[PDB]
């Protein structure tokens, strides 16, 4: 998480997926202490599995979005280990290189 044009930030989507789960898990805790009407506790547990499935792997159940403007799947722990660059492929695929140059020949 970074601080961009003085007052603007940039966020890895994992961080909002991790916050979502801290949300759901903490509300589940407080809903057990403050009385457990079942169908309520069950909604919250459903929400908890849904937010674990979220930060682990999106697009397997319909994707969770950031706001009503960038309706584009948040990048999950599964996205980072596959796909266009990922972790496995990008090392094989080739990186930029410090001591290098071009010119015409």
């Amino acid at each position: 998480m970074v601080q961009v044009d003085g007052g603007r930030f940039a966020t890895s989507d994992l961080n909002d997926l991790y916050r979502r789960l801290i949300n759901r898990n903490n509300r589940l805790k407080k809903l057990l202490a403050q009385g457990a009407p079942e169908i309520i506790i069950r909604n919250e547990k459903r929400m908890l599995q849904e937010a674990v499935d979220a930060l682990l792997d999106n697009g397997r159940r319909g994707a969770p979005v950031t706001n009503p403007g960038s309706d584009r799947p948040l990048r999950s722990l599964t996205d980072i280990l596959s796909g266009k660059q990922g972790r496995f492929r990008q090392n094989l695929l080739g990186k930029r290189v410090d001591y290098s140059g071009r010119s015409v020949i």
Partner: protein, 79 residues
């Protein structure tokens, strides 16, 4: 000092998952706008992960853990 000839992937017991971690992420608190500094026990804690201050390497290598109240499935093994 010793060489790395083999790598193995296994399933990690939650007792393991607690071992690799240094402390639990408590609150859904990233950082506040007033002070660009880690909030109370949040995703970017320094006690848990390491100092953002000078290197930045111990911080990209120390993990935290979340303590679920009800278990949830690793969707990989479901879908």
């Amino acid at each position: 000092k010793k060489e790395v000839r083999k790598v193995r992937i296994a399933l990690a017991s939650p007792e393991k998952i607690r071992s690799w971690s240094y402390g639990e992420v408590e609150k859904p608190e990233t950082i506040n706008y007033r002070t660009l500094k880690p909030e109370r026990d949040g995703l970017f804690d320094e006690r848990i992960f390491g100092p953002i201050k000078d290197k930045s390497i111990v911080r990209r290598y120390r993990m935290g853990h979340i303590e679920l109240a009800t278990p949830a499935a690793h969707i990989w093994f479901v879908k």
